[PDB]
Amino acid sequence: GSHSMRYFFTSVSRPGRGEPRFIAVGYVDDTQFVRFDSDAASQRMEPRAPWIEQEGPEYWDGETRKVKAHSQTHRVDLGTLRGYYNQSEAGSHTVQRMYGCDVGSDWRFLRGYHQYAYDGKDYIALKEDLRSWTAADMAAQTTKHKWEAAHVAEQLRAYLEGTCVEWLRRYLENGKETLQRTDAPKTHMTHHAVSDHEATLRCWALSFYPAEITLTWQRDGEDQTQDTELVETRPAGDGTFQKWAAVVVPSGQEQRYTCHVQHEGLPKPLTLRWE
């Protein structure tokens, strides 16, 4: 199965309320493994997954050193964009940054990411070629030129292709039981009468990992996409996820409906029918 490693960074300015709030989290697939928070007491990169707690002082000291560095960088960046956009010092602004690498089933490099957003709008993004930058506007173009001049893409390329992938495979192995597990969803349906002529049919997918899943309803094999109530995949809170899809069935028509579940840890897709 393909895997990925991503680092998400969020910085918010607190005008007259101290220095910007920085929150850094790291993920391997759908599993968070580390964290840093500017408002934290420790001021250290902390583990958020058992398997990463096995890393030594060297690792924790280096990540702490590097993450605080990112923190500062984002403190500068808030001021910088504020300048680029001729914005008031009173306004609270958000800078988010994301970077990571994906590896195929072969655990080989597939793609690297390095994007930024300012107040929710894409600012700049490394293009797939790992050689060019999508500068959103004039401001983002200023940053692009700086980066083309400083040859940032080349240093990133080496990271995204080398280091990033190297650490991913390491995490993958070191946290095997967790990261290299596929929990098939525990499915089941509920039937609740909504009226004297209709009923709700809900199909459940629970305790599954990874989060990738397809949960659909069909009437006579015909898809009911337009008529299905499908919720966003929720985290169970224990490392597995949940999701449901519901349809309103006219009484006596339950048999026409089939729910279908597709998931990596499922030997063969499921087709559930109320009967």
Binding site: G26, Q72, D77, L81
Partner: peptide, 9 residues
Amino acid sequence: ALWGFFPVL
């Protein structure tokens, strides 16, 4: 693990 180079916008 994090990137060791730290760029600024």
